[PDB]
Write an enzyme that holds these catalytic residues in place. Sequence first.
Site, PDB file in Angstrom:
ATOM      1  N   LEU A   1       5.283  -9.566   2.918  1.00 24.92           N
ATOM      2  CA  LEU A   1       4.726  -9.957   1.635  1.00 24.92           C
ATOM      3  C   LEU A   1       5.830  -9.969   0.581  1.00 24.92           C
ATOM      4  O   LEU A   1       6.974  -9.585   0.836  1.00 24.92           O
ATOM      5  CB  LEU A   1       3.584  -9.025   1.236  1.00 24.92           C
ATOM      6  N   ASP A   2       5.492 -10.424  -0.620  1.00 25.99           N
ATOM      7  CA  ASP A   2       6.433 -10.476  -1.728  1.00 25.99           C
ATOM      8  C   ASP A   2       6.148  -9.335  -2.703  1.00 25.99           C
ATOM      9  O   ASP A   2       5.241  -8.522  -2.498  1.00 25.99           O
ATOM     10  CB  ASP A   2       6.379 -11.841  -2.422  1.00 25.99           C
TER      11      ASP A   2
END
Lengths: 86, 172, 122, 12, 128, 606, 156, 127, 459
Positions: A40-41
């Site tokens: 994920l970011d």
Amino acid sequence: APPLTLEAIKDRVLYVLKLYDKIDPEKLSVNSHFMKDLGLDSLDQVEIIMAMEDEFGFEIPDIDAEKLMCPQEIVDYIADKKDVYE
Amino acid sequence: AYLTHQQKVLRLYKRALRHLESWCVHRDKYRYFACLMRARFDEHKNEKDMVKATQLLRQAEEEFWYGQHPQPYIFPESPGGTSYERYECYKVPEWCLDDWHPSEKAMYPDYFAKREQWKRLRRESWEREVKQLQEETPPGGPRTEALPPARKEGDLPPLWWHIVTRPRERPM
Amino acid sequence: GAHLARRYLGDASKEPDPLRMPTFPPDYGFPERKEREMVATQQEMNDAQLMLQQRDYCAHYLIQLLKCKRDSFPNFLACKHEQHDWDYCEHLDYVKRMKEFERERRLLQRKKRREQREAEMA
Amino acid sequence: KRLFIIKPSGFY
Amino acid sequence: SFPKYKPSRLATLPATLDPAEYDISPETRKAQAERLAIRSRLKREYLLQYNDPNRLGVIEDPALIRWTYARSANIYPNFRPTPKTSLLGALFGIGPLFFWYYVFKTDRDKKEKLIQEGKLDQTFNISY
Amino acid sequence: MNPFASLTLTTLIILTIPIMMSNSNIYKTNLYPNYVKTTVSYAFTLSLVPLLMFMHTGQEMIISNWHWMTLQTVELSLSFKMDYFSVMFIPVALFVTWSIMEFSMWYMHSDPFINRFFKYLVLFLITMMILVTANNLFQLFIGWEGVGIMSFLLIGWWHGRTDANTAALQAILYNRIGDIGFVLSMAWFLTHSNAWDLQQIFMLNNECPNMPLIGLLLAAAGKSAQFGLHPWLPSAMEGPTPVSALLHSSTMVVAGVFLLIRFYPLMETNKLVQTMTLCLGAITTLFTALCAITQNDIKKIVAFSTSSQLGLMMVTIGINQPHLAFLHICMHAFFKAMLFMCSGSIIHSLNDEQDIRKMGGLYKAMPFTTTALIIGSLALTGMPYLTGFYSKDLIIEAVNMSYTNAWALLMTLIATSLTAAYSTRIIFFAFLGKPRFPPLVLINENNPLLINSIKRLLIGSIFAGFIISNNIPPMTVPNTTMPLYMKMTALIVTIMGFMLALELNNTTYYLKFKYPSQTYKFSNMLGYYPSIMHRLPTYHNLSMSQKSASSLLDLIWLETILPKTTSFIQMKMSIMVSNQKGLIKLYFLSFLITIMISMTLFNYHE
Amino acid sequence: HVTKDMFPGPYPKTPEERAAAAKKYNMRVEDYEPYPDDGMGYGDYPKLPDRSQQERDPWYDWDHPDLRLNWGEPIHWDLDMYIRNRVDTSPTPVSWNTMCKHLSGFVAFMLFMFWVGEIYPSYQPVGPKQYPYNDLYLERGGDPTKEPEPVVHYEI
Amino acid sequence: SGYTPDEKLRLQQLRELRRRWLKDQELSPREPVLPPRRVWPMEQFWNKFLQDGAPWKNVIYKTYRHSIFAVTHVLIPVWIIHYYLKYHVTAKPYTVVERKPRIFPGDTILETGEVIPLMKEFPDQHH
Amino acid sequence: MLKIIIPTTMLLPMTWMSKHNMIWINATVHSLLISLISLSLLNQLGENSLNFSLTFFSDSLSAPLLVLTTWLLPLMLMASQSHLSKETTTRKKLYITMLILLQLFLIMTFTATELILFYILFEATLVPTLIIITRWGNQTERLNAGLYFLFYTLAGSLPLLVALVYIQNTTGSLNFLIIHYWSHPLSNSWSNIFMWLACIMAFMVKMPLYGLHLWLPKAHVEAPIAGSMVLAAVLLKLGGYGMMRITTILNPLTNYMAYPFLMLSMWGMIMTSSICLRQTDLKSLIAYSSVSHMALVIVAIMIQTPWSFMGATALMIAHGLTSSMLFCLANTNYERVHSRTMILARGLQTLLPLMATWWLMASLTNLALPPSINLIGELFIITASFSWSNITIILMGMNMMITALYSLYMLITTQRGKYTHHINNIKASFTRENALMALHILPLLLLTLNPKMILGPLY
């Protein structure tokens, strides 16, 4: 307030992380590195940590929010937050 | 040390969405607006030269500063909450136990027995940990408040007692 | 409300002044105007120890209200015709004030334009 | 269960 | 982002609208390295006594004794007869006493002037 | 006269017995809360009997037994004047405290000092009863400060609660501002009237009470949370939720209003002083309700409503409706409290949370409270045939059917609409909608004490207005011939505010983006009044006390204007006296000059 | 443990003594800035930022979290009115001038609309309650000796 | 960045020490050990009545507890206030003063038997 | 009064040749016995002062102060037991001798017949306190403390001596009974103003008055605790007892020259109370509080009304019991923490339950809850001042509000809040200082039941 023990907390976070549609149930692990294991970011990391914010009720300091990587140490963090031992 | 560029936006994005759910109130309404601002946050994810992101910082931080709710939902245990710093009137420092009349200590015999060994455990640990911390600290003192670990043999983590013997968050 | 408009946004002299009117002799215009008479004597109000604002002409009914009430104990759902006489007395007494209000109103209305008629004919 | 409550020595 | 909040003495500019938040110069970010270091040791020495089991009683707080000593002792040695100080000394000195002197004198003179010929409300006052 | 007055004396001492047993350290601290229940419930039980003869024959008297001070011409003795106001307020107060601390036993049980807690409510109760059962202002002053310091301690129940300490600090501070008028009235009565007991002051015919009336008005303003003296009442909500369903709920705030109706014999004399009450009361009705309209709490909003209500009855006092105001207070005490622990029951069940934005979906899951809050929400608005009906609707007509300033009425209708609008709002966020609450579904109200404590307040908040209204003879001339609409206006002005809020609640569901409206912020900082009053004048007053005052005046000038100057003068020229080099020629030269100037020049020989 | 050098000295003038008070007061050289030398006696004490304890971050590990202070670090000369319970300098979402303008406006207007309402005293269109027995002459407190001036009214 | 090799086991070490600490912060089965309650056998002679389990056996004791409440908190008071004011307070002039009840012209006085004459017919304006 | 004088001086041989450990027990028990004997002095006739002897007389003004001194003497005896343990026996007996000598001079001062005899023992109290303040103090400044306290009182004392001996040559006697009974109007001649003045600043310098008070913060905050109570509780009131005495002859001058001191005081307590709110040392607040409370007394005496005199007497006794309690309270905290900084030891309710109470009503008596004698004295002053001038009310009413502001402030900044975790020496509260507070507070409520004994001869 009933004696909410870590086992209930541990189940709730992993269930919500599995509930998180972008962390799929099969690809969710106990030590789920959002950046590496889950990919994920940074913004999703905010969304993840503040999801359990409203889901658990207590508060996560921001300087501890970005540090907190994996559900296992999510579990340990809430463990030392209330100081659960059972 | 200094707050890094992507770190500052993470802090601003944090309470901005808390401001959003304060504004939207309803879960679905918040979910719709949170995702819209998520893409808005992702609109210029690219920054290349740091000077552009500094200007993008200014507009962004100005947005979330006005984005506060007039009465944002501060949680009960949030700083300034209804239950925040509420039970501090109950927690008492651990050393007060030593200041107990022998009758009270005797009528709690097992606890004072395990308190004694904990008091003993503080002794050798403090001895070992201070001669552990002095040389683990490089010249010029500690460059930061981070404190070195118990990486030696049979050694306790230095500067642990007040952390370990912290007044439990639910003193009751 | 309506009379407030006729005085504030209209002519103040046209509407009666609540703290000054009436301004004309009540016997003037009613030759032999009978006096609004009293039913409950001074000692009736005195012995009942009635309060001054409720010691008006309707107090004659009011003492009857308390006396059925002071004797309706225990019950409180009785004592119905007593007020039916009292509030009607206050209903008509408020009309009497209202009639006096309109009397002074049309007293002011009539003379002002009657004097205006004189101002017109000169 | 019961935890431990800490109080100043009220015997005095 | 809107007509910006103007900082005030009793409500300062926040950590957001402050220019230094987004105007981080190399030396300004460099400054947050040694102030952290002195705080690190200052926090360290506090822990070396606060977590010291041998230490008992109360440790001295240098800043607190600096505050008390400067708030109690070192004002006169640093005091100066500066005309400004004498100016604020004058208006907060004889000023208010002359203020209340005139007010109470005027009140007493205005009050007294009607007692000697019976123009006050005193009939039900026989206690003093 | 063998019952009644004696019974009242029995009632006010049996409430002290728990304290006497508490301080005797023979009582058992475990069942003492339940022991407190029995005392208050019994004290309420013996509080009904003093009503019985007042209904029967209406007798009133004053009890003054033990003479304290002789003070030459002014004797002082403990004295209770039992009149209409005091007699029927004791059961109303007694019933309220018994129910609220009945609820508080279940609620306020997770704290070590619940014994010390319940004792504090007892220490409030006799202080409040000292205030209401009073015959001279000094005893009322005793209760006045007693409850004020009682709030100080009760608001700061958690001594580690920083916000509660500030609220307690503001709580007494504003209350001491009110006592300035109390002292002003105290001095005037002892000087111009030369009396302290209530009876003498009224009947001395003080037809020039101008300054006393202002002093009385200022006293009630501080106690009843008027504008400028309001924010402590919202601040008192910081303490434990039962404490909010206590002194400041509807009990202590109306003490100043009780003082206002107490001095109604002289209050009506000055129309000017008669006016400024309903003004400040009207502004409180608009402002506090306005703040509660756009707000994000539960206890705060109903606290703002209480101040709006607290502005209501003494508006009627401003229009000379003393007994009607007192009826409204007891009705107000009924349902205002009634919704207070119902909100507290929600707070306890939903993990000590206060903001509305985390409520929702509680209608079916919180059945008994849902009915209770629903009734009480517009019971405050008072639908026909209810506690609020015989008080609020008559109040709106009475001010309308009277001689007031043009704006006096308009605030009253604005009050009724604005109060109802958020009265509907708090239901919408709490019960209707969807449960914006944590996934763990702990929500429960099965506690028997929870149900029973509120249960007696359903019958109170609904039945009391009807029974009391027929049980109390009218005091003023009834409003019979009336032009219709200004009575029906009170009922209607309630429903579009309910209707406007209804669609406003619906607009929350609407996915339309919302802007930070000026009104939203304006009502959320309470009109920014605490944002500047607690900031600017306090900073100036505190800051000047150090730069000036402590240092500049005292520590810089006073010790320089007398001690240091004279010390320096001796210091400076003691040197020139003592710095003699010792030359004999110089010494005897001084002899020669002294010898020469002894005569001729000074002519000591002449 | 205490000495003059670490005691608060006179007003600092030379840059070396600015550094001398800097190590004593526990800041850096650039972090030392004494009050103005107007003769008020502040002297060597530095003009610390005009902030309150409410502005302090709760999350930081304060050595005195009850008031959010840390051991050893310098404190403010005017700390006493700038602590959590007392006056606070934390920012407000509304601009201070604007909200002060809002207060100075509303309370001014509030008096204004009532003032005109006093100039426009509303009343019902009804007559006066002329009370019997000379509007209760003796009862209201009239003189028993002399007869009243009969306020006797006929019926309409 | 999670943690560091320093922080990782550092948190682990303090956690387990804190964990065992909280175990020691529990209450052992023998805790608390209390001393004997010095009490005459008199109250146990009626509090074993309530433990018998019969519907009478425990409600009457609660009614008895209400009864002992009345005598030692309400009943012995009403005596000593009554003794106080009707022999000592009423023995002083004007200590208690009662207002004149609203005697009705039409009603009668109990002691003198005098019926106060009532006024004549009312307007009787029946609506 | 030698039935009190003779046993009091007999305390000296008994305390000077007792055993090395019984000095505390012996002194405490018989001083309390003297207090019980002094309690019989509460009896007063209608208006005749009890004229026991030619050189001794008492009335309803002297006796309440007399009992205050005698009742007080065991209180410093128990208070000093804490920090006087680490001392030699001979020096310890020297300390007891100073306290007893201070008491003996106090009783003779109040019971004095003429002004000159009153003046001799009045001032004579400077010597025992000067040794107490200086010899047994704690910090370097105490040397400057003694000189400040000595010269300030003396600077005003000497003019009174000249005026007093001038009275004897003019009137023919200095006896208080004759002076009041042979009282004559004082002319407004320019000499008579200074004649009036010389009999005033002696009493008001030690009141203390606004401006002439700097010795008060420089001594009470700095004297040993035992000397601190007697200074605040009684020594300030020595001006009060004198001023009711000297005002019997200095009339009708008081009408004019009261003004320069009246609003000097009237702006005074409001100013002083503002300083109390913004202190940094604990004992500095109560010292600054004492002058603030003393300020309303100055107005009470000077206004010359019977109601104010009763209010002056009641506030005088009430403040003595109060100020002694807070000074004792500060001493208890200072001993364990070895400092007097206010915010040094905030939040101690969690560790000091009974102390937190002893804070509670001691501050409440400082707030003057009703019906404590503090208000009974305070309210009487208000009514007298209002009768003098209506505009008075705002000032001291605002003062007792800022008085209220700080009087909870140390309660918040000493008991409310969270303990300091590094502090670990707050032991179990010893019954000695604990019972000391009990003996302070119970007489306050006991006198609240029957205040009629402490309004002075004007009641």
